[PDB]
Amino acid sequence: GTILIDLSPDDKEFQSVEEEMQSTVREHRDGGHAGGIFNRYNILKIQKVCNKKLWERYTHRRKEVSEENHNHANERMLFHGSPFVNAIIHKGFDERHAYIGGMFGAGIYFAENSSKSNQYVYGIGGGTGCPVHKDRSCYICHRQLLFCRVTLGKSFLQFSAM
Amino acid sequence: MAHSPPGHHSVTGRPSVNGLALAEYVIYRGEQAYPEYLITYQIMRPE
Ligand SMILES: COc1ccccc1N1CCN(c2nc3c(c(=O)[nH]2)CCCC3)CC1
Numbered sequence: 439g440t441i442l443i444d445l446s447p448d449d450k451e452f453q454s455v456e457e458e459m460q461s462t463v464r465e466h467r468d469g470g471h472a473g474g475i476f477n478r479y480n481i482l483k484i485q486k487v488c489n490k491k492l493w494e495r496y497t498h499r500r501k502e503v504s505e506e507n508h509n510h511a512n513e514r515m516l517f518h519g520s521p522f523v524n525a526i527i528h529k530g531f532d533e534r535h536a537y538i539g540g541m542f543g544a545g546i547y548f549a550e551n552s553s554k555s556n557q558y559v560y561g562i563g564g565g566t567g568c569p570v571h572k573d574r575s576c577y578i579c580h581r582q583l584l585f586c587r588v589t590l591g592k593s594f595l596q597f598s599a600m
Numbered sequence: 601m602a603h604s605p606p607g608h609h610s611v612t613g614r615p616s617v618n619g620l621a622l623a624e625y626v627i628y629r630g631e632q633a634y635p636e637y638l639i640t641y642q643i644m645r646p647e
């Protein structure tokens with residue numbers, strides 16, 4: 439089902455996605471414990487994820503949400519870091535990906551800060567870091583994040599203490 | 601998987617202490633996100 443199209447670094451679309459990654463790095467209150475110590479990334483590859491079934495599933499729900507929220511899907515582009523990236527691009531998000539321990543209940547979490555999502559690529563709290571070196575701040579091993587299209591609809595505003 | 605509050609479609613978690621932290625969002629239906637870009641990267645050691 440899923441096809442991955444490599445984007446050229448000379449393409450405006452690649453440069454735009456990279457800029458969103460780089461410009462949303464921030465410092466984290468754990469000093470880098472979960473995700474590592476860095477101010478920027480080395481972008482190695484950006485692939486467009488193509489899946490007709492998943493896309494039509496997404497746009498079908500988007501239209502339902504839009505009609506329940508004064509014709510406004512409230513669609514965002516947001517980061518998601520997860521060990522389950524390979525399952526997500528082939529089968530989509532589902533209830534197995536619900537973060538029971540999340541601060542806003544058992545759902546699927548996304549971040550505006552790329553570096554927030556980077557804290558979860560190796561698991562909750564960075565897990566034990568990369569599989570080869572067990573290093574949550576590994577500078578060697580390749581990581582993967584998703585940049586996702588997300589329908590928020592009417593979003594409940596929850597101020598957090600973070 | 602839980603539910604969003606009645607009348608809502610997602611939750612916006614907005615940090616109110618760290619003024620540089622951006623928002624985090626939660627959806628409760630897998631079909632409300634599409635994984636559009638797969639980004640392969642390394643973090644870079646500060647110089
Ligand atoms: C069922 O969950 C897991 C089980 C076993 C290992 C890992 C995960 N999950 C944890 C939640 N995940 C996540 N949480 C957040 C953000 C994000 O990108 N990903 C960014 C905003 C803040 C929270 C994805 C991976």
Ligand SMILES: [Zn+2]
Nearest residue numbers: 568571576579
């Ligand atoms: Zn490593």
